[PDB]
């Protein structure tokens, strides 16, 4: 079961300036207080990123292409984004990948699905016991063939919270080279209204996984009866990567402190 | 220098003694040329000093 | 090589050498022993669930199971002579514990004792063309052991049965689950029973009182494939004990070299494994088993200066070891 | 037009399918167990089938080749030893096991 929620306010997309964002560690070599030049795919400084948000009237989960790795930043409260879709054609014609950062587990797989037009999850709002219980899991229509699945330790994370300033600045960047998928991540306690901030920070490597498939497009997952809804306030930004050359400054403690676009 | 890798060992640890000498030849040619360029530079500046 | 004076004579290509100082014989501490290190990589592949499983299915319904993302120890199955045969086809059997794959597929079933030779690739027969076929350039291994005391009864276990009637020969790794009553003749047929219309599945006489060749044999087929995808199960990363403070030669996670190992206090980032120089030489390695910082230094070297007077005057010579505190002179 | 100290004529009979392993620097069971040629080689290789000469329908089973060895062999080394090779980690004695 999966239905199409339509009741929204209609708005055009927006752009934002990615000032100095989208740097990471491309390797595992340690340096201390070293200036070193490297050539690789990055976000060039002072480019434009696409800005999307979910408010109250906005419930925006489009389909976006994944080429050369993409940059995904989110300023959020109460963890509204939960999942991620990847695939060439996303509809059992080519094998495709799923991420769910569930309230209990984290569910990680590559299989052969037929995802819906608007997959989403729906958590109920204050259903007489003051606790938001998750009830709706509307992702796929089937699961035909599978090659890799993984589920980790179950854990606990909140499904409730209302703040006017988004606290979670979750930066992610995803790459796929020769079947190895690299996810670099960062969480930041942020105090900002509706913008992406100014600053410099690299991203540690979080996930490296050898699948070996082709990906063209992606989509994320947002949290919420089947008509009429209330989605928590959140905002996110989407950017692309290009081949460039950079310079990296390593400090005494061994951390990237600055980079220079060439 | 157009050879397979910059480690002597990795060429030795992956290829055959009927094969690897071509790579080693490339390595010693490039490094030897750089060294001879260096001694030219230093000897000219020595004349200057 | 008799004395340093002869070394100077032999490198200046003369028999008399005039008074002065000469630079000859760069030396080195000559590394003494081997070492290999690999992580505490104990996460094994389930060989016991595909070999020491309590029951296999029959040959018409051969069990296929894929193994990936673990450590495979083929040796404990290789050295065991408890199995009736081990016929590997694409790989030399000693290379199995040094070469490795990107996928594992295992097909376990039970066949007759005399039918164990049709499992060879490209062959013909009842099993080889009616039940399970191997391709002409098959990559894998076929492992068989008798299990007459495991799943054979004196009454006759007729639940193990094979395929006797089949319309066409099978492509490799195909499964014929159909029980359609085959028309071995040209006459049309229907119903449950008819003339020249045999049920395709025909029973084995697995009893322990039958002779050799008529006993149940558990047979498993490994159909791994090579050099086409990123390797997912490898297994054999053998490491020996850790030594320090001597010139050795090492293998740390495929990184081979020679030198001396020292405790260091550099602050590696937890994902960082190497630490290199301003001009890019590896001198900082995190030990794969227990995470600790190892400074790598190439053990000492230096040229030898020879001071001589005139050979016309004397043959008594002196040796300068340069840039070396002579605490370790002899090598 | 050339003159030599002496020449070696080395003769045998093999299966045809393995003929490619005769070049110096090659590998494989023939090249690595029973016959090995050094890589400084200066001579020629010559092959012809003798299918109508020796190949009998009953089977020419005096044609043995060495299929196991503990180690590789030197160039221009010839082995005749019929001691039993052990493959598994189990040591063996006597003749068969």
Curated annotation (Swiss-Prot), chain C:
Reported impact of residue 205 to S: In strain: Omicron/BA.1
Region (Immunodominant HLA epitope recognized by the CD8+): 157-165
Phenotype for residue 80 to L: In strain: Omicron/BA.1
Consequence recorded when altering residue 202 to Y: Reduced host ACE2-binding affinity in vitro
Record note on what altering residue 210 to T does: In strain: 19B/501T
Consequence the record notes for mutating residue 214 to H: In strain: Omicron/BA.1, Omicron/BA.2, Omicron/BA.2.12.1, Omicron/BA.2.75, Omicron/BA.4, Omicron/BA.5, Omicron/BQ.1.1, Omicron/XBB.1.5, Omicron/EG.5.1
Effect of residue 207 to R: In strain: Omicron/BA.1, Omicron/BA.2, Omicron/BA.2.12.1, Omicron/BA.2.75, Omicron/BA.4, Omicron/BA.5, Omicron/BQ.1.1, Omicron/XBB.1.5, Omicron/EG.5.1
Domain BetaCoV S1-CTD positions: 43-236
Residue segments, region Receptor-binding domain (RBD): 28-250
Name listed for the protein in its UniProt record: Spike protein S1
Organism from which the protein derives: Severe acute respiratory syndrome coronavirus 2 (2019-nCoV)
Species classification: Viruses, Riboviria, Orthornavirae, Pisuviricota, Pisoniviricetes
């Amino acid at each position: 079961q999966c239905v199409n929620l339509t009741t929204r306010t209609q708005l055009p997309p927006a752009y934002t300036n990615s000032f100095t964002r989208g740097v990471y560690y491309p390797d595992k070599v340690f340096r201390s207080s070293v200036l070193h030049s490297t050539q690789d795919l990055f976000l060039p400084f002072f480019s434009n990123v696409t800005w999307f948000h979910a408010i109250h009237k906005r419930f925006d989960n489009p389909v976006l292409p994944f080429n050369d790795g993409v940059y995904f930043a989110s300023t959020e409260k109460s963890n509204i984004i939960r999942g991620w879709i990847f695939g060439t054609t996303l509809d059992s014609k080519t094998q495709s990948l799923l991420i769910v950062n569930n309230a209990t587990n984290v569910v990680i797989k590559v299989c052969e699905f037929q995802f819906c037009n608007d997959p989403f999850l729906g958590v109920y709002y204050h259903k007489n016991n003051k606790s938001w219980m998750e009830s709706e899991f509307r992702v796929y229509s089937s699961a035909n063939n599978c090659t890799f699945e993984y589920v980790s330790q179950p854990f606990l994370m909140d499904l409730e919270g209302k703040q006017g300033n988004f606290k979670n600045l979750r930066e992610f960047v995803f790459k796929n080279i020769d079947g190895y998928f690299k996810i670099y991540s960062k969480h930041t306690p942020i105090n900002l209204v509706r913008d992406l901030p100014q600053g410099f920070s690299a991203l540690e490597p979080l996930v490296d996984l050898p699948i070996g498939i082709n990906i063209t497009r992606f989509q994320t997952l947002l949290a919420l009866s089947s008509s009429g809804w209330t989605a928590g306030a959140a905002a996110y930004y989407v950017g692309y990567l290009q081949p460039r050359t950079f310079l990296l400054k390593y400090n005494e403690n061994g951390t990237i402190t600055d980079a220079v676009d060439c | 220098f157009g050879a397979i890798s910059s480690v002597l060992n990795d060429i030795l640890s992956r290829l055959d003694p009927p094969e690897a000498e071509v790579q080693i030849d490339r390595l010693i040619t490039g490094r030897l040329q750089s060294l001879q360029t260096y001694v030219t530079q230093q000897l000219i500046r020595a004349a200057e000093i | 090589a008799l004395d340093p004076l002869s070394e100077t004579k032999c490198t200046l290509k003369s028999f008399t050498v005039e008074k002065g100082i000469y630079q000859t014989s760069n030396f080195r501490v000559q590394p003494t022993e081997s070492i290999v290190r690999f992580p505490n990589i104990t996460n094994l592949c389930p060989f016991g669930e595909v070999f020491n499983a309590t029951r296999f299915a029959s040959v018409y319904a051969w069990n296929r199971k894929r193994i990936s993302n673990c450590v495979a120890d083929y040796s404990v199955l290789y050295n065991s002579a408890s199995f009736s045969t081990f016929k590997c086809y694409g790989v030399s059997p000693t290379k199995l514990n040094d070469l490795c794959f990107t996928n594992v597929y295992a097909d376990s079933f039970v066949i007759r004792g005399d039918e164990v030779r049709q499992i060879a690739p490209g062959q013909t027969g009842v099993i080889a063309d009616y039940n399970y076929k191997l391709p002409d350039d098959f990559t894998g291994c076929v492992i068989a052991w008798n299990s007459n005391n495991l799943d054979s009864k004196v009454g006759g276990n007729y639940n193990y049965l094979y395929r006797l009637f089949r319309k066409s020969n099978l492509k490799p790794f195909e499964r014929d689950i159909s029980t359609e009553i085959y028309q071995a003749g040209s006459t049309p047929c229907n119903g449950v029973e008819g003339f020249n219309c045999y049920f395709p599945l025909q029973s084995y006489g697995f009893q322990p009182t039958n002779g050799v060749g008529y006993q149940p044999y558990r047979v498993v087929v490994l159909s791994f494939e090579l050099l086409h995808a990123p390797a997912t199960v490898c297994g054999p990363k053998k490491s020996t004990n850790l030594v320090k403070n001597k010139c050795v030669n090492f293998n740390f996670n495929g990184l081979t070299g020679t030198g001396v190992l020292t405790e260091s206090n550099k602050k590696f980032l937890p994902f960082q494994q190497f630490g290199r120089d301003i001009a890019d030489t590896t001198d900082a390695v995190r030990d794969p088993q227990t995470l600790e910082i190892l400074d790598i230094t190439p053990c000492s070297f230096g040229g030898v200066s020879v001071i001589t007077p005139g050979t016309n005057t004397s043959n008594q010579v002196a040796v300068l070891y340069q840039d070396v505190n002579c605490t370790e002179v002899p090598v």
